[PDB]
């Protein structure tokens, strides 16, 4: 009923909510459509790889807090799954 470094992980969810910009999602989708942003060297920037990284952090931190019997921690968990749902909802069914 009291926190430890689950603190260091509740902070990381909320500040990861400056990595859910509109153009972060829209770049992910255009990668899905096969239109990644070209570099001049040849090859592409990979915006959907950044989105996979963001999902991984959020998913990991939500697991950290999943069964922590504490109100502050359960609030951060709901925010992490609201954000995961926000991303999943954009992609599910896309391109079909």
């Amino acid at each position: 009923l009291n926190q430890k470094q689950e603190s260091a992980i509740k902070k990381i969810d909320n500040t990861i909510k400056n990595a859910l910009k509109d153009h972060d999602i829209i770049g992910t989708l255009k990668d899905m459509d096969g239109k990644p942003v070209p570099k001049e060297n040849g090859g592409y920037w990979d915006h959907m790889q950044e989105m996979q990284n963001t999902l991984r952090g959020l998913r990991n931190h939500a697991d950290t807090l999943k069964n922590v019997n504490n109100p502050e921690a359960q609030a951060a968990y709901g925010r992490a799954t609201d954000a995961i749902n926000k991303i999943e909802s954009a992609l599910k069914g896309y391109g079909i």
Binding site: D22, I26, L29, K35, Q52, Y94, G95
Partner: protein, 313 residues
């Protein structure tokens, strides 16, 4: 002779072509871009509207509505044009100008939704449109409509049976809505009683939700580049009881295998076609499948994606 009464009735009877330079010579590719709107979805665009007519729900004044950013939208567009229906497609605003032009040319009405809301925003708007007059609008619901797998049980399946004289041993199909795999399996395993058939679902490694579903794991989807499959959930039209095996394909295996199909076989191929073939090749490195007849679905042609990273060398 045969004179078709409109373009929707021309679906199917797509060729089964042996792959000569890819694999050992036992991979059979069914080229579903040989279809009125040049994808496998042509079949479900037709039958889903035929079924709606047969059910009586589609009547004078009733209009069609579906959310889709993919080949289902093209399939519904040509059928509605062929049979005199009004179609509204809801879809994200990330859709290209060229894709909008193709649909408008087929007479479809387009509703573009907020890009960051992705597909759910397009799904929501379609539901709000039908809610504004449920008697005027009808939702096709490609993921749940059993008319989706019904046409593959009535057409795609039988064609594979007839063309192979029943000697198909493995059937491989990437899963978007699940209809292709479900109906084809359902015909060959049920109607013809070949329970021996090994049915293989193909999905992306970066969104492997079918494999998660059969392990009892929690469903954790992600972005992937194999356009057309990999919905990120288990659609109602996917009957998991019929899936014998699921193979995840990486983005880069699908691109290069699709490019192999074009350069080595002369078959224009999209990413989802390269992925299904890549799964056949992975199955053939197991020596238990070395002498089996493998039928693979090739859902679309690479020329539809001429603007994409599929063409980078």
């Amino acid at each position: 002779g045969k004179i078709f009464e409109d373009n929707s009735l021309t679906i199917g009877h797509t060729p089964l072509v042996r792959l000569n330079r890819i694999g050992n010579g036992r991979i059979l590719a069914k080229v579903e871009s040989r279809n009125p709107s040049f994808s496998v979805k042509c079949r479900i665009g037709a039958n889903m509207i035929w079924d709606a007519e047969k059910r009586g729900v589609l009547k004078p004044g009733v209009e069609l509505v579906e959310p889709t950013s993919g080949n289902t939208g093209i399939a519904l567009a040509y059928v509605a044009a062929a049979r005199g229906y009004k179609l509204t497609l809801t879809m994200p605003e990330t859709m290209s100008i060229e894709r909008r032009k193709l649909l408008k040319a087929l007479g479809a009405n387009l509703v573009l939704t907020e890009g960051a809301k992705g597909m759910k925003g397009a799904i929501q708007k379609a539901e709000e449109i039908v809610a504004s007059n449920p008697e005027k609008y009808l939702l096709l619901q490609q993921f749940s409509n059993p008319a989706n797998p019904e046409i593959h049980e009535k057409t795609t399946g039988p064609e594979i049976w007839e063309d192979t004289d029943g000697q198909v041993d493995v059937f491989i199909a990437g899963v978007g809505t699940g209809g292709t795999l479900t109906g084809v399996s359902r015909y060959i395993k049920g109607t013809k009683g070949k329970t021996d058939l090994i049915s293989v679902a193909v999905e992306p490694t970066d969104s492997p939700v079918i494999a998660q579903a059969l392990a009892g794991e929690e469903i954790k989807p992600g972005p992937h580049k194999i356009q057309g499959i990999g919905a990120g959930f288990i659609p109602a039209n996917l009957d998991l009881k019929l899936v014998d095996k699921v193979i995840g394909i990486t983005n880069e295996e699908a691109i290069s295998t699709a490019r192999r199909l074009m350069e080595e076989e002369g078959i224009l191929a999209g990413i989802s076609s390269g992925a299904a073939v890549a799964a056949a090749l992975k199955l053939q490195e197991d020596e238990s499948f070395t002498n089996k007849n493998i039928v693979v679905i090739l859902p679309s042609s690479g020329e539809r994606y001429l603007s994409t990273a599929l063409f980078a060398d």
